[PDB]
Design a protein around this ligand. Sequence first.
Ligand SMILES: Nc1ncnc2c1ncn2[C@@H]1O[C@H](CO)[C@@H](O)[C@H]1O
Ligand SMILES: Nc1ncnc2c1ncn2[C@@H]1O[C@H](CO)[C@@H](O)[C@H]1O
Ligand SMILES: Nc1ncnc2c1ncn2[C@@H]1O[C@H](CO)[C@@H](O)[C@H]1O
Ligand SMILES: Nc1ncnc2c1ncn2[C@@H]1O[C@H](CO)[C@@H](O)[C@H]1O
Ligand SMILES: Nc1ncnc2c1ncn2[C@@H]1O[C@H](CO)[C@@H](O)[C@H]1O
Ligand SMILES: Nc1ncnc2c1ncn2[C@@H]1O[C@H](CO)[C@@H](O)[C@H]1O
Lengths: 234, 234, 234, 234, 234, 234
Amino acid sequence: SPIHVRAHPGDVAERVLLPGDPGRAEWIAKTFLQNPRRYNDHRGLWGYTGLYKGVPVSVQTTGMGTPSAAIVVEELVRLGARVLVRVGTAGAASSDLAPGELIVAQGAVPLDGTTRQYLEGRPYAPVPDPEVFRALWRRAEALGYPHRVGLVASEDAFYATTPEEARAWARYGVLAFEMEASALFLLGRMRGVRTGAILAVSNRIGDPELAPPEVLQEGVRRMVEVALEAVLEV
Amino acid sequence: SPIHVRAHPGDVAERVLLPGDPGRAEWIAKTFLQNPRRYNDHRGLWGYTGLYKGVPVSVQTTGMGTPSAAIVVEELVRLGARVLVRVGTAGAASSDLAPGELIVAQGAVPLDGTTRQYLEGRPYAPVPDPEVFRALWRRAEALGYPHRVGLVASEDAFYATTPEEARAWARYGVLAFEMEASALFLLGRMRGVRTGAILAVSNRIGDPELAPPEVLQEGVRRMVEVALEAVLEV
Amino acid sequence: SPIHVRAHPGDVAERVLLPGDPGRAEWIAKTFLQNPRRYNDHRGLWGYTGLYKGVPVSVQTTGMGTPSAAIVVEELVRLGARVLVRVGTAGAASSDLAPGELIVAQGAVPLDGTTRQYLEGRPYAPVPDPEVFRALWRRAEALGYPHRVGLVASEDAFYATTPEEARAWARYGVLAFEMEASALFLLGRMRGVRTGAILAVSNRIGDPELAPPEVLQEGVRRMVEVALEAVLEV
Amino acid sequence: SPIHVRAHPGDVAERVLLPGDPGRAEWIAKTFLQNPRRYNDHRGLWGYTGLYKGVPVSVQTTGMGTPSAAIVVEELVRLGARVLVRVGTAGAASSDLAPGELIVAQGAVPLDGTTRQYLEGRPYAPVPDPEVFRALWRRAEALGYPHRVGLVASEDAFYATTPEEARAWARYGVLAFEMEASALFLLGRMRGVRTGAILAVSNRIGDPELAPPEVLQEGVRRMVEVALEAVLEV
Amino acid sequence: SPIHVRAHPGDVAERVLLPGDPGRAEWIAKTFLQNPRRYNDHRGLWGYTGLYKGVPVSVQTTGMGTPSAAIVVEELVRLGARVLVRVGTAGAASSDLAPGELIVAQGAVPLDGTTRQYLEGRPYAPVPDPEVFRALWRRAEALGYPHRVGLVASEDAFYATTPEEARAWARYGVLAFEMEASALFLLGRMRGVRTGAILAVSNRIGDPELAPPEVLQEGVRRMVEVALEAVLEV
Amino acid sequence: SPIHVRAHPGDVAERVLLPGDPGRAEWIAKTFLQNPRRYNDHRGLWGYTGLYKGVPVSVQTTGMGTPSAAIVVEELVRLGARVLVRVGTAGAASSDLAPGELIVAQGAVPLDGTTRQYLEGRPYAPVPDPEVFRALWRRAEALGYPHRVGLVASEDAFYATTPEEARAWARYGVLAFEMEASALFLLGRMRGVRTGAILAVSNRIGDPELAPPEVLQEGVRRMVEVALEAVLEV
Ligand SMILES: Nc1ncnc2c1ncn2[C@@H]1O[C@H](CO)[C@@H](O)[C@H]1O
Ligand SMILES: Nc1ncnc2c1ncn2[C@@H]1O[C@H](CO)[C@@H](O)[C@H]1O
Ligand SMILES: Nc1ncnc2c1ncn2[C@@H]1O[C@H](CO)[C@@H](O)[C@H]1O
Ligand SMILES: Nc1ncnc2c1ncn2[C@@H]1O[C@H](CO)[C@@H](O)[C@H]1O
Ligand SMILES: Nc1ncnc2c1ncn2[C@@H]1O[C@H](CO)[C@@H](O)[C@H]1O
Ligand SMILES: Nc1ncnc2c1ncn2[C@@H]1O[C@H](CO)[C@@H](O)[C@H]1O
């Protein structure tokens, strides 16, 4: 059994969703999955498995940061995960993005040391699996939810980025900041598995608090629904 | 008039194709465009403009390497370019990519110094414009032309990369090596224009020569058609 | 109330133990603290406050990785944390360090990207607060529990480091690898709070699994006992 | 037969001048060479061969940037080039260097990615061949043409450098900016050939346009004379 | 016999004091030791050996800069040196340190190139041997001499660091700047010997001159006394 | 009066030779200078001033390593030094350089941290003053001494470079390793003074000991002579 996600042979399904927060994971399992069984709770890394419209689907908590997320991904791939789609939140880098908006990550700027350690310092363009990416973009369009497509930046120091630095990054195409995408995408190519990421803007860089819970929840629901319909596509 | 691409308002169309080789530019102009006209030949940067299915389309040579293409792109943008798609060739990094095969660039690892200078050393994930990327992908499918969608690595030193170094990059998802995409993608986001890149494999890194004209030529023809159909879509 | 550790000023004591796993947090609260109360469970970041020999002591879960821990330390300081001692586990860099042995961290090689982001790429020597470091070393001696005093290395990629790379680092004095210390030490200096770190070796780098519960539990119990005794000393 | 400069050993003389602009290459062949013959035009990399004062000399275009130049240089060496002297233009970094003034590159600061890739990140001091350097310096003195002997900077991003960044570099000895010297000098030492570079200042960093056609043209004329007189002396 | 410190077997004692200035090495030997004997003077790297309270103690000059210190340390170790304590001067970074104050180095920020070359660019936390660190601290207290325990920064360019930068580093815990600590600490771990460092602030960064030889002198005597007591403890 | 080289303006001549070894500075003074007087002995940095064929000439010790050398050079410039020429030894990186052979430094690969700190990490090509370099070159030929003209590499860790790395560097043009020239050349440009460097190969990289006293002493004498004759022409 893996060191952190202590699950067994058949616990994890080929299709997995990766929320960073264990609380969102739980909500997804109860709200969208039939016959949900929690196969792991060690280290608060709640992971569940059930059926979504007849297809087996897993929901695994990654924790915050790429160091934490990388661990979960590597182990999920060992357990059998084939398609892993992250469903998280992000802080808008600019002002054209408003809380509640969705982001289909086309790529993730690697500002984290996890991808850096796996790459031994080499440059790199973390991008999701083209198919998964395409699937997320279609489903989002299909459902008709206000969404954006483009770059996000995966960082490590949540509290080190200043609004001014956020603006500087936006001039480079970064729509928002998060802390897991880059490593996921990198591992996707390294371990030969299909990955993707869709985010829900929960705040603007610099905000002392997140957007009103109502606004937030609605974006999360839409995001999860897109991700779920998308994972079935591939 | 710009310092390198000495063209005047009206010469360059909104839609532009960016081949690295000026000989191909000439060929594309005569072969696909009605009433082709060469608006620039300074420094060998042969740039044409004609109509493709009634729509204005320009074909501007970039030269080899990001330093060169950067110059061409920055200036084309000043002149009015809004949608720029590079149609070049690349060297297979892996063994599954067969010469002649097409690659729709989903992202470009930045191993060049041009992106490094524009970014001041900051990490980055060069990606094409989502819409353009999407259009290129779809058009390839609609035309029934086999294709690969993925990452390419933009490098500066053509003769530096060893097959062993290539296989290493292939393990990170790099399909092939070329020398212009990264800066195109970066400038795309920096200047607010939509870019893209479709490449025709012309060899497999390590090869003393390129591939047989005929096998590679049909690839080049398809690439251009896809690229032309795509720029009219967006 | 902070964004991640949803608590208030009066919920956190001046002295805080920082385990990485919420499971140990809960275990410490119930096993060592009198009248322990959980002030947070958001994101699984389990936090407890109670009394130890009459002195208020908080036990906050940090999660895995400096990005997670940094978010948690920044917020604990905001909430009035003054003395923070990490009580975690680590992987031995050499064959001579056996599971269960204790390590009083004299410093932490910064291999993570979190410290890097805060330091804007500048070199640095992550070190504990001198008085806390000395307090941990003294209690360990006063209690008659064997221990090692030295350097540990804070990394981002759990599954990148191979046994050969770890032993190479051992030549430079690295006793073990873990994933939180460096940032804790850095933030200690940046935010002006006393911090320290004590670890219990739970495995040798490269081991498929961790050591058997009993062997490790006594080391963990000892570690926790030393930490609580040391925080009351400062 | 090289992949880019499609010539064969024998088409290229041991003495070669390396202009960036292909039109300048043509001008030099028809102007100073007897029985000029173009041996390559592939990729617009115009190359000529003829006699200068009874000695065989080649004028090969390199294109803009160290990526393009490194390719041409690597192939010219294959074709058997022994002495290669760059004859280009440059943008003044200081305010004392006026358009039309000549520079005998004593060294070239490597700000490009080409040399970086070749050196694998290692620091380096790009310098010409001692003798070529001396011959150029001597010939410029003899012909009594006002010149400067010092450092130039080789960059990748033409439109990135600002007047302020240039003045800053001037304080370190950088006399002017260009885009090929560094790679030429590096490759010279690596492939066992003699290289050198003489430049004619055509503008000041930040200038929207080059200097008057007339003023610039004379400088180019002296530069070539100096270069031709020099390569014949080694 | 070593290349620089031309001593013979047995000349060097197991415990060694390392002043950067030969003038100070001479003074220490003739002031605190019994039967001071000079075993080396080649390259001005004055080294003495005598008895401190019946124990053999050496005082080896290091010179300035980590490159010089590194040579001396390497050769001393190769000669049998076991305990090496640096006794030098430093430049205060903040106003929180006055001239004449003693600093017991807890660690040393590696801003130098020597540590960098030995580490091949890898991050690192240079610290003293724990016991030597502990001893230095313990003796300072037992002798009633005021002192500070914290970080110092080891740099290369003495005349480059500005007061503004120094204050910046202060925000990260840097108490003062010196030029040998980092390499000594690193070599201590690599070479398996016990090192440590105590410094006497002799000025503020930016000061045109060093503090009056009076206020400074008492600080230096205290520093040397503590270091002597210390090396005997280990 | 400077902090390290405690001399008065009149003490230092416009022309200065900069040997690293204080013992050689003395030998130079007593062997080539008429009426030589020592103006400094503080920190072992022995400095002398006398007459060479009627012209005032100073001989100032630099110590080992760019850190120490930069200090000395900075202070000499502030004292009035106009022409500074290093006269030292170096370690051959290849087999075609025998001990006792002379090298006129055309440039110096900056492997040191001092130049790095002064440059704030920017790339660069340490080169001497054109005229000084020319004079050094011309004199060596005039006195008919066997010499090489090319690159050296200034390093920080004397004991880190392996015969293998030395050879790798040799393929890039490096003839020998030393520890001062790079910072000298950089400062020469920054402070507006004419610098130069000439070395006498005294060993091969990896040698336990230096060559026989006589083979090397003749090289040193020729080197010192060429430097003297040279500074008199600048
Ligand atoms: N402003 C922000 N900066 C970084 N990560 C953010 C932000 N807002 C939300 N997140 C996401 O949620 C967590 C931080 O609250 C991270 O896991 C990250 O992916
Ligand atoms: N193996 C290869 N490596 C780098 N660039 C290549 C390769 N094959 C084709 N190219 C493309 O064509 C040029 C090099 O011939 C570059 O402009 C690049 O875009
Ligand atoms: N071998 C190891 N490598 C890295 N971190 C380790 C190791 N063993 C235990 N840890 C610690 O526990 C977690 C990984 O299980 C990390 O949070 C880290 O601090
Ligand atoms: N200001 C400048 N910046 C960079 N390259 C310049 C400049 N002026 C002239 N050049 C030279 O000419 C080309 C850019 O026009 C490059 O190949 C370069 O060598
Ligand atoms: N301001 C300062 N900056 C750097 N080193 C200093 C300073 N003051 C004293 N020193 C120490 O003494 C020498 C410089 O005089 C160096 O060896 C260093 O360790
Ligand atoms: N092999 C070598 N490596 C580095 N520096 C050397 C070598 N041989 C002689 N030196 C020179 O002499 C000193 C080291 O003894 C340095 O100041 C340096 O300039």
